[PDB]
Amino acid sequence: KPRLLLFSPSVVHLGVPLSVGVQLQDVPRGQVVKGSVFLRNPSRNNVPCSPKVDFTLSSERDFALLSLQVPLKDAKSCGLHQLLRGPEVQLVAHSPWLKDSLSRTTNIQGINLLFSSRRGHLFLQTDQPIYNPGQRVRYRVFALDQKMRPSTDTITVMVENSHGLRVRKKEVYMPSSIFQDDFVIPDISEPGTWKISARFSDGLESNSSTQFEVKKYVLPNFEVKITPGKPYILTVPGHLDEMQLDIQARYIYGKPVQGVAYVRFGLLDEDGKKTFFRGLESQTKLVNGQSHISLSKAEFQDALEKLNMGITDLQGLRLYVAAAIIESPGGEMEEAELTSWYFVSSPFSLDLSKTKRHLVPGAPFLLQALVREMSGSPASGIPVKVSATVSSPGSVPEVQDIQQNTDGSGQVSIPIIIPQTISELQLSVSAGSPHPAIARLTVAAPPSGGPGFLSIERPDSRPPRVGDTLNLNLRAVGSGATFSHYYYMILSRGQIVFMNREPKRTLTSVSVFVDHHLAPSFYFVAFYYHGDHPVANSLRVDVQAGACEGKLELSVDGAKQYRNGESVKLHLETDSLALVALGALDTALYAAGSKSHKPLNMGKVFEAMNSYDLGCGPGGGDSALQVFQAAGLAFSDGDQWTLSRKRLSCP
Amino acid sequence: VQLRVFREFHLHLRLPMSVRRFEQLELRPVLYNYLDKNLTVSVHVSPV
Amino acid sequence: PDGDFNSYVRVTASDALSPGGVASLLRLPRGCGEQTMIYLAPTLAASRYLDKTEQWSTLPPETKDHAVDLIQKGYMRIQQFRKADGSYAAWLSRDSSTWLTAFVLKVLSLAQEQVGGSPEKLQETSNWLLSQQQADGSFQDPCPVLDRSMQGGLVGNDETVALTAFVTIALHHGLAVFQDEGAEPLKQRVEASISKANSFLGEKASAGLLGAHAAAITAYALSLTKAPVDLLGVAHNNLMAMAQENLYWQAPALWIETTAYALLHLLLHKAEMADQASAWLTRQGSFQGGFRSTQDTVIALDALSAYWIASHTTEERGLNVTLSSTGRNGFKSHALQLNNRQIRGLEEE
Numbered sequence A: 001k002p003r004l005l006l007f008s009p010s011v012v013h014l015g016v017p018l019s020v021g022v023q024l025q026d027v028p029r030g031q032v033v034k035g036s037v038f039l040r041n042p043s044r045n046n047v048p049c050s051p052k053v054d055f056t057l058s059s060e061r062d063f064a065l066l067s068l069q070v071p072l073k074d075a076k077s078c079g080l081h082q083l084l085r086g087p088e089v090q091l092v093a094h095s096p097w098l099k100d101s102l103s104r105t106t107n108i109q110g111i112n113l114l115f116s117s118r119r120g121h122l123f124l125q126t127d128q129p130i131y132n133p134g135q136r137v138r139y140r141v142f143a144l145d146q147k148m149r150p151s152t153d154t155i156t157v158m159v160e161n162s163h164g165l166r167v168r169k170k171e172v173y174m175p176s177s178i179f180q181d182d183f184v185i186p187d188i189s190e191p192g193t194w195k196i197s198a199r200f201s202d203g204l205e206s207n208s209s210t211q212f213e214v215k216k217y218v219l220p221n222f223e224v225k226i227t228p229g230k231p232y233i234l235t236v237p238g239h240l241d242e243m244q245l246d247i248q249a250r251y252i253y254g255k256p257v258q259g260v261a262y263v264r265f266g267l268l269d270e271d272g273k274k275t276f277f278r279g280l281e282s283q284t285k286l287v288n289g290q291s292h293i294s295l296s297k298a299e300f301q302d303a304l305e306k307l308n309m310g311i312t313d314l315q316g317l318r319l320y321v322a323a324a325i326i327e328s329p330g331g332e333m334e335e336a337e338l339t340s341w342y343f344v345s346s347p348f349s350l351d352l353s354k355t356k357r358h359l360v361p362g363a364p365f366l367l368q369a370l371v372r373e374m375s376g377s378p379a380s381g382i383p384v385k386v387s388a389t390v391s392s393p394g395s396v397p398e399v400q401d402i403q404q405n406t407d408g409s410g411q412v413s414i415p416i417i418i419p420q421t422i423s424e425l426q427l428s429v430s431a432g433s434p435h436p437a438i439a440r441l442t443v444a445a446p447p448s449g450g451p452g453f454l455s456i457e458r459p460d461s462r463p464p465r466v467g468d469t470l471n472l473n474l475r476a477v478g479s480g481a482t483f484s485h486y487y488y489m490i491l492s493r494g495q496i497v498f499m500n501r502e503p504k505r506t507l508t509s510v511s512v513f514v515d516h517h518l519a520p521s522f523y524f525v526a527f528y529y530h531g532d533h534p535v536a537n538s539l540r541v542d543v544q545a546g547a548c549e550g551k552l553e554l555s556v557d558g559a560k561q562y563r564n565g566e567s568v569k570l571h572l573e574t575d576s577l578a579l580v581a582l583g584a585l586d587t588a589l590y591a592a593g594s595k596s597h598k599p600l601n602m603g604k605v606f607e608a609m610n611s612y613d614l615g616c617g618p619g620g621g622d623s624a625l626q627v628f629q630a631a632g633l634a635f636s637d638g639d640q641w642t643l644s645r646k647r648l649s650c651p
Numbered sequence B: 001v002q003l004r005v006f007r008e009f010h011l012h013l014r015l016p017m018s019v020r021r022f023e024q025l026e027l028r029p030v031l032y033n034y035l036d037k038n039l040t041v042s043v044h045v046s047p048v
Numbered sequence C: 001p002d003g004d005f006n007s008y009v010r011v012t013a014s015d016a017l018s019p020g021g022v023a024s025l026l027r028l029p030r031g032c033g034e035q036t037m038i039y040l041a042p043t044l045a046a047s048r049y050l051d052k053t054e055q056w057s058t059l060p061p062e063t064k065d066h067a068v069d070l071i072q073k074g075y076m077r078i079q080q081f082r083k084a085d086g087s088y089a090a091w092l093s094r095d096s097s098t099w100l101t102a103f104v105l106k107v108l109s110l111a112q113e114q115v116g117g118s119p120e121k122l123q124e125t126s127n128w129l130l131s132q133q134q135a136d137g138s139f140q141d142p143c144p145v146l147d148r149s150m151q152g153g154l155v156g157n158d159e160t161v162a163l164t165a166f167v168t169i170a171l172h173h174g175l176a177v178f179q180d181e182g183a184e185p186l187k188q189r190v191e192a193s194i195s196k197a198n199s200f201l202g203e204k205a206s207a208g209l210l211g212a213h214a215a216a217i218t219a220y221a222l223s224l225t226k227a228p229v230d231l232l233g234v235a236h237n238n239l240m241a242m243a244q245e246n247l248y249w250q251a252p253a254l255w256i257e258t259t260a261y262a263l264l265h266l267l268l269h270k271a272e273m274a275d276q277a278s279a280w281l282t283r284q285g286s287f288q289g290g291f292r293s294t295q296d297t298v299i300a301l302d303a304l305s306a307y308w309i310a311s312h313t314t315e316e317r318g319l320n321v322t323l324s325s326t327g328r329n330g331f332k333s334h335a336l337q338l339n340n341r342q343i344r345g346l347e348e349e
């Protein structure tokens, strides 16, 4: 009956400490256990290439969170890098209490993890997005560790040519976590996109890359932007909406542009074949720098019939509009093109990725949807209708209809109720009217006869910020109240962070303080033992993207306008001593560039931090082992264990 | 931090990337007059 | 004549047995001096096969320690049956047997990597094996093994040649664990004895008219123990001349044993020929409760592990290019090398 749990992340990143959580379940008050935990290679020999970490547990302290280092030297020593097929290492928890008390066959219990080689973060920056051939390129690369603090490790940068050939390689010994370097593009370089990579010398797969386009150009004077009236066209047989565009020309310094806009229309398929209408062209002057144009239904249908086609064929095609305005009397001409005006049959969209799957019976099932306009910002105030059919539990199926208007950012949380002994649930979601966006989802109930279910309820369905406490309501449904505590844990960025023990009451509430080491998302895994079987549930929370751990405000007090040669006072403020990496860039470079090349902002940093995570899906499982596997854990008590990951990426 | 600069009266000159020697070209500097007063100027290129 | 010259060089490089079945062989040894070997041999073979094939990731870590402790207990089991001169007979009172000593020596040598047992005790066993050698290098078994069905393909038209080949195989396996210092006459006489035995085996293979299993084990013994060129060549030619046809040779244990021995010998010698033999062996081992006799289990597992380790090994696939030319800038030669370089088909300019 007594059991010793063991939790650890599914994937080990060599050279970075491993968060191993041990727990003691159903132990008499008079028993105190002590042992050690270490990594181990199963093939070479039982040679522990990790410093053994001791743990002591008792009735009053039945769990302990240990940090287990995995140094590079020991890991290389045991032949982990000499394995032929399969990068797999084992973690073992050895204690003499197992043999003495449980009389087990052996006193070794553990899991089969899957090591990797990624470590730390590297960020690369270049002087400007687009370069002229034969122009110097200045790039700097910052290096940080997994804790997001500056690192002094050694990287090996390398430039690549447009064809893919290496052009320059270097190795650096950073004492300041920044490396700056210059190189010259060959004068005869053909147009293309060059890539700069940077990886840790020890870690083979710890690379990070940036791209810059090489193209022969002269910096423009003004930018031309084409904006559709709506980002979509309704090709529904009932009706076809109006096609109207606004073309705006603006000098780089703000003043409008006087000139003549020449616009041409055509069809464009996803393959990349353009079919222009020999006609329908527009030639209009610009008033206040903006010109309003439109294509009437009659002329559009005439053009379509002249092309030997009907309006039914406009399924994947998009209307392609090209413009080439000529400034007057300067004479300079600039061109713009639009490749995002799709033909659609529904002006809305539905994203049911937030909705859980295979959820517990006897508790409300929350359907979460994000209604978004076709190629646009999330909608608000658009009614959403859900028809949920609870399939045969033994009798005829029963249907329910619930309608709710989206509040803000498109979020809608519709609590469809589900009875006990449910078989399956079928969900038909329709957003907006007329011309609704329809989505479907089917959920299969867990097999009957289980030891119970755990329901995790979130009273607030909005993304918490940083520094705000979060409350979840744990409850046990369809089970016997024989236990006394709920055990829960948090999983952020692929490593166990928190592990606690909450007493059991009616509607137990747990509070988690959203700190700065939980962003941009975390998994809340809770469970309890109903006799000799685990009952578990999980949940994913997306912390809202906001400010940094520190701060940096570059502010220039005064008006935006200036004059060449003026002196500008630039203020920098932080919370500690920091190496501010400054850079001032022209804006006409973006106009010169054919394709958008977004810079390094907080979105990229947040994606970098959470790319190390092992979680997969919005949470929930048919059993305890499935829940832990979805979360990203490695559980093994003696009778149950999770099979090793087959590949780093979830199916 | 966007930081725009302006003159309210300036000369804009845009030369090509390169030109073959002995091949005639045309320079087209443009005067921009964003002031509220109608003006008159004299434009010349310094010999070299 | 007043132009600009540039040059660029770019070198573009363009490029098993199911774990459950083998795991079931782990059984705790029990019984007399023969039953312990009966239980241990497939168990140690299974442990070695899983260890080399790296299939432990499909089993819980408790299994590995259980297997280690089981093998330790099995090794300690025969320590009480040892005689004065390391004979390792079936019983303390009963007389010894050459095959039993050879099997014990081979198992102990193969199981010395996990537990450190005194090699000085293995010296006496090797000495006892040497003391029974004949003038031409052969050996005679004073008493046949109690169970004859567990011996595999040894029984047949010829028995002495196969027994001598197996004893030589065991001696070579125990040769590796010999201490790098001390007992120099012992290792010298071991080398002389094995050389004489390879000479005898080569002469017998040249004579021909040998059993299939006997020919296979003699060929493997010659190939492993560094036979001379002529004897190894004639033995190999004799062995290949009797090859049958992916089907090769519910199959009898003799077929499995001879196929495994031939596969191991040939791997020691792999191009469109070992694949069919390996596939047939794997298909035979896929039978529920397959690999009946202990000898076939051990030999097939060793052969399959060796084949896997040979097949799954990779190659460096390096490359080097050097350019040398003479010009007004003195003389200069320039060397550039691509390789795997962590990127399959590295390209340099």
Ligand SMILES: *[C@@H]1O[C@H](CO)[C@@H](O)[C@H](O)[C@H]1NC(C)=O
Pocket (backbone or CB within 6 Å): A205, A207, A208, A209
């Ligand atoms: C790192 O390199 C691999 C190839 O080794 C590549 O597939 C991967 O995209 C790179 N990671 C980046 C650029 O973040």
Ligand SMILES: *[C@@H]1O[C@H](CO)[C@@H](O)[C@H](O)[C@H]1NC(C)=O
Pocket (backbone or CB within 6 Å): B036, B037, B038, B039
């Ligand atoms: C400048 O020129 C316009 C004609 O282009 C003329 O009518 C006007 O009187 C002049 N003076 C101004 C705008 O002060």
